[PDB]
C-alpha cells in the first residue's frame, strides 16, 4: 500500500496540510479549536459546536478560542485529535487516513512522551499504514536545495537554530527556546493595556496577532528609539474604532532578542544562532556562518534580518563573511521540504510501518527518527 | 635554592595526575621547565610506569594486529606485561610510544582459559559500546583467590580541537562456587581548553554479587552487568548534567534575579530597605 | 626563561583548577626565579579577609593590596596598619563607598549569599575598579560548588562632552562538584575569560559606576550562558560519542541514510 503520502506539518500557531510532490500547501489554517461562548437559543444555528479552520476564523466573536499546542508541546490531546480528524475530513482533504502514508513534523528536543502519544493517535485512532516524524530544519534545507547551513526558525511556539553540514544534522548543537510569536503576541497585548486599549477575550486575542503581523517593526538601535519620541501611527480594528499604537509596536518584538522583558531567562534568537554555530566543530563554523536560512512567521518583522546581521557582527569573530539568506515563502518552507522528502523513492525505507509498530512499539519509532 | 630532591617530587605530582591527551606534553612541559633532563627523565620513568597502568591504555605490539591494555594485573614484575588474549609477554617502553621484543609465555591457565572465552565475548560488546574500543582481560591468582580482571578504555584525542575525551573501566570478577563477588570502578574524563578551560571528571564504584553457572552464561552475564551500568552511568552523566547542572549551577548563581527583571542601577543607587 | 613562564602558564592551564594554590606553590618551589612573574600572571581563587573594626568580610587582590597589608573597603584601613598606605582621593573614596553599596545589592540579588568586595584605584585620566565575589554552595548537600568573580574595569573619562571609555576584563572561576542520583559523582572545573569595551555618555541621574555595572550584568548573563554551553557542548558530544549504545544501530541506519541522502542529492538538483 504505497499511495500518494500526506504531509501534515504541525505547528502551535498554524498547521499546514496537503499531498506530496506539490509546489504549495493547499490546506493551511490556524491550529486551534473554537467553541461557542453564547447560548444557542434560535433553531437553525451553527451546528456541531466544535469549530476548526475557516469557520472559526469567520465566526471568531461567538467562539472561545483556545490553542492545544504551546511551545511545540500539545497540552490538550483531544483537541489535536479533532484537528487531525478535521484535516482528513471532507471539509479539507477529502481522503481516508487508511490509504495514504503520513509525514509528521515536530520541533527538536521535545518530550518523548508527546512523540509516543502522537504515534499512538496516528496508528490506533486513525488507521495509518505508515508514519514518519521528522525535523523542521532538515525539511527547510531540502526545500531550498542546500545541504550545508544553519536553519534559524521562528514560528508561534518554538525558536531553534539547527546546524547541518552535508546531510549531518548534529543533534547536540541544536539550540532551542520556549520564546516565539505567541509570547510576542502576549507581550504586545500587555503593552496595549499599558497604552490604554485592553483586550482580554479569546476571540479578541486574534486581533492582537493581526496588529502584530501588520503594524510592527524592529529597530536597529533600541537605545536610540527609546530616547526619541514615537509618531503614534493608527490602525483600524475589525469593528471600526481607531487605535493609536504608539511605542508598543517597536518594543513588542524586542522580546525575541531580549527575553528578560517578559520575565523568563533565555538566550534569545541572535544568541541561539551564534550558539548553534559555536557548539559545532571548528572547521565547519565558517560554512555555517555563510549559510544561515530563515523560516517561520515571526522572522517577517520589518528590519528583523538587518538586526540579526548586526547582532551576529557584534558577537561573532571579526573578518568573517556573514550571510543570512531566506526563501520568498518563509511560512511554507518546512512543508515544501516535506512534500519533496515524501515524493522521493527513499521515503519508503525511513518510515515506521503499522506492522513494525504493532510488533515493537515506541522503541522502533525512537530508533527510526535518530 | 630548592633542593634537587624537591624538584623531582614536584615533577612527580604533575606527571602522576596529568590529563592523558596532554600528559606526554605535560612531561614535555616539566622537562622544558627544569634545565637538566636526567633528574626529571629518571623520576618520570617511575611515574610513567604507575601512570600508564592507571590509564588502561594499550601499547600496540608490532605484529599482533590488536591493542593490549596495560595495568597492575598485567605487570609481570620484570618491566614486562601480559597479553592474555594473544598470550605473549611484551616489554613496554614508557617514554617511547611502542612496545617491542616480545616473548612467548606458556602457563597451565585453567582459571585463565575459562575467562578467555568470556574475554573474547566482552570485546564484541566493547565494540558495540564504542566506535574505537580496546580491552585486556587479565588472568591472575590473588592471595589464593581466583579473579578475572577485564579492562576497557577509549581514547579520543585531537590537537586542533583542544578537547579530549577519555574512558577507563576497571572490572574484577572473583570465581567462587556457587556465589561469586564483583568489584569495579568506572572513571570518565573530558577536558576542553579553548578560550578557557572546562573539565569533566567522574567515577562510579560498584559492588555486585554474581552466581557462576556456564561459560556461555558467565560470559553474557558480566557483560550485561557492564552494559547496563555503563549506559545508566552515561545516561545519568549526559541527562542529569544537561538539566540538573543547569539548575544547580543556577541555584548557586541564577541567570536572572528572583524578580526575573534585570536589576535597575538607578533603583539600587536611590532606594532604602529595612525598618 | 621566557619559555619557562610560557610552560608554567601552559601547565596551570592543564592541571586541575581546583588545586591552583597547592600547584602554584609547588611550581614556585620548582622555579623560585619566576615567583614574582607567576604570582602576577597566574589567576588563583580569591582570599578571604576580615575587617575587625566593622566586623565584615572583604576580599583580597593585588590592586587593593599595598605591600604586606590590604585596604578594607569598609573602614578604608589596611591590616596590618601601615603608616602611609596608598589611599584613593576623597572624591574617589566616596565613589568607592557607593560602588561597594551598589555591588552589595548586585551580588545579594543574583546569588543571595557569599561575600563580595569592591576597590577603585585612582588614575589621572580615569578611575579603575575591581569587583570580587565569592559564593559557596550548599555544604550539607553532596553536590559542592562555588562561583568566583574577578571583574576588572578601566574607565577613561573624556574631558569634553561627558563620555567615558570603559574596558572590562572579566574572569569566572568555577568548580561544580556533583555527588547524587546513585550513579556516581562528577566534578567539573571551569575558567572562561571575556573582554568588553564601550563608550557611554555620562548621565547626571545615573553615576559612572552604574554604567560600569551595566557591563557587569550584561557580561555575567552572557559569560554564564557561554560557560553553560561550553560545559554541555563538550560533556555531551565527547562522552556520548565515546560510549553510545545507540551508535551501532544508528550506524547501520546512517549507512542506509547515506544511500538515501545521495539519492536525495541527485533529486534536489533536478
From TrEMBL, chain C:
Cellular localisation: Cytoplasm, Cytoskeleton
Keyword Metal-binding belongs to the record: no
GO cellular component annotations of the record: cytoplasm; F-actin capping protein complex
GO biological process: actin cytoskeleton organization; barbed-end actin filament capping
Keywords in alphabetical order: Actin capping, Actin-binding, Cytoplasm, Cytoskeleton
Pfam family, one: F_actin_cap_B
Domain of life per record: Eukaryota
Membrane spanning residue stretches: none
MF GO annotations: actin binding
Chief location: cytoplasm
Subunit relationships: Heterodimer of an alpha and a beta subunit.
Protein family membership: Belongs to the F-actin-capping protein beta subunit family.
Role played: F-actin-capping proteins bind in a Ca(2+)-independent manner to the fast growing ends of actin filaments (barbed end) thereby blocking the exchange of subunits at these ends. Unlike other capping proteins (such as gelsolin and severin), these proteins do not sever actin filaments.
Protein name: F-actin-capping protein subunit beta
Organism per entry: Sus scrofa
